[model samples]
Target chain A: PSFNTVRQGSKEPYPDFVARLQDVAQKSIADEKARKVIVELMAYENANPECQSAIKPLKGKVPAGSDVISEYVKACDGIGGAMHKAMLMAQLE
Target chain B: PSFNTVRQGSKEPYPDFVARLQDVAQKSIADEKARKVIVELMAYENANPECQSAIKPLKGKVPAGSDVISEYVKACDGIGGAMHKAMLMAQLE
Candidate 1:
């Protein structure tokens, strides 16, 4: 099912990516560290180019596996919101 | 920081959600069942009405805390894709 789509692909929404990863992470992963690495590392390969760049360097800055995700999200909140604002501005007539 | 934003609120994007819950589930919840319940149950309270209705009853069908999310997302895929289609059509000039 959707769990099979765990690996992020181009044009996939980030939430879909997270849901798929979370399932495979909890269902199959045996090593806690392995679980964390996959959770944390996969963002580097995100479908969003801006996200890929935003998270590429967080590999060392945050707590691996456990903390990197939120940090990346929190960090990207600005990026996502920025894009939202830019889009809104562009749409203004 | 972003972990603090787990609960679904008005207009919060669903992906922002998975990131927030993913952190809290890993860091705070220890019991596997509790972790699963939180992961699965939280969606019922989702900011998206379409999602809330889509997942309200999977409480028993899918493997709770385990399989429900993807099922919800997959189920929502039809709904989400449908919305995306409408949005795409609306944008057509």
Candidate 2:
């Protein structure tokens, strides 16, 4: 229900956006609801090239569970902000 | 070139499929090429309900890098085959 109108933060970095998405999804009414919220967040994230590239493989599929989201965030952290931002700019160009 | 005609292993379990997809994509011609391959694999994986569910958040995005893929596989492994398969069935029903 809440996820039906979910939206992403405009100025938030990709990693934080993901974390926020996960947080909202986890607190959702049900697993399916959580999945819905996650999808919305991803759709919002599609505006970023790096995030878009990172999420391409999951297109046409459901939002992954919290564990997968957590791993994704961890991987993002490993990649670091500068690298991710650089990729984002590269993708934009 | 290789990922153009790629297809998923019908009998292969989800985790193995992900691993194989990662392996092939990693060996592709370029990062973009690898992303393409990963996207193709994801499209194929869309046939499965669980994968579909797990990937929904990534729709309209680009396929992630090898490191992200590796993390995804690891996360999938942590989820375990039995539970993943069970989720598949649940999503189907």
Candidate 3:
């Protein structure tokens, strides 16, 4: 759905912009396609000049098909597991 | 597709069974359908005779259309947000 680019408004703070984008990513393209776009957008945001100083060290360069990408996938998988666990725990309560 | 019931083997421990079920839930169902089924399964496990005693207070008797169900949804939503945050952080690294 082209991500409704207008939703990624420049007026919003970077954190808010990312959060809103994440929600859209979840509801819209939440399959493998969404994962790829979300990751790419995050990489772009990391290097964007406007929010460049907000994050430490800039996460400078992410080489394609490199360990950086692999590590990100692994970590996201771990977080996904954690999300399931959190859901289970909440229900168990 | 129906979840491979065989995967939720009796031999597996409760935690392991739930974990495996969750992975299937994510990869196979991974949508609104999965969300409903996952919640139902968790509620069932919470009240199942075999797992009845494991969790304190039993999480017993979660009446339908009750606050318990609402709370569970809210908590899961929080976890989902956290999951997105985690993914962003990992990619930014």
Candidate 4:
């Protein structure tokens, strides 16, 4: 689909899909606002939580690259084990 | 709104709204699929390009944290200047 209408495939991983999204988006001739809205609208729910954080902050910024979450997972990697535990705790909350 | 119904506020940053998304999602007992679907459905169009990529890759993964894009943006920050130029190049395409 064109940038404005891209959807996360049922089996698609977030990174690969977004890479495709960013690839087309940069050339779509849409204003930054249009470019930004298309993404969150189309792919936000299909993404991972770690991946989710990477995008919302981007409203005022441009896409930095195609692989938006790898570096993020690694950076937050050290803290992730904690999330795993918190996740379980939240289950009981 | 509840996680399943969360929307990007017209003036909300992607990160803040998603922070709210993640917070409600982990506890919605919405199951992973339900949680994931709501996000994509609700916010895909309101996010930045860099952010768009982050969420689409998350289909099969759990969120690792609340702050998903900061490290991503930072990690990719070095490459950002190129995007600025490429952005201009794209305009001429």
Q: Judged by TM-score, which candidate is best?
A: 1
Candidate that scores best on DockQ: 4
lDDT of each: 0.47, 0.41, 0.35, 0.40
Q: Could you give the candidate ranking by TM-score, starting with the highest?
A: 1, 2, 4, 3
Worst 10 residues of 2 chain A by lDDT: A1-10
Per-residue lDDT tens digits for candidate 2, residues B1-93, read 222213234334545665555455556434643353343334333224454344434333334544433333433442345766676665434
TM-score, structure 2 vs. true: 0.31
Q: On residues A1-93, what C-alpha lDDT tens digit does candidate 4 reach at each position?
A: 234345344324555555555556547634543343334333333344443343334322334654333433332233235553454234212
- Return the TM-score for each candidate structure: 0.35, 0.31, 0.24, 0.27
How would the docking of model 1 be graded?
Answer: incorrect
Candidate 4: residue B74 lDDT (0-100) = 28
Sorted by DockQ, highest first, which candidate order results?
4, 1, 2, 3
Better model by DockQ: candidate 1 vs candidate 3: 1
Cand. 4 TM to true fold: 0.27
User: Clashes in model 3: which pairs?
Assistant: none
User: lDDT score of model 4?
Assistant: 0.40
Interface RMSD of 2: 13.2
Q: Which tens-of-lDDT digit does each residue in A1-93 have in candidate 1?
A: 222225444434555455566557657556554455445544433224455345555633687345676655544444455563453334221
Supply DockQ values for each candidate. Answer: 0.03, 0.02, 0.01, 0.06
Report the Cα lDDT for candidate 3.
0.35
> Taking the candidates one at a time, how many backbone clashes does each contain?
0, 10, 0, 32
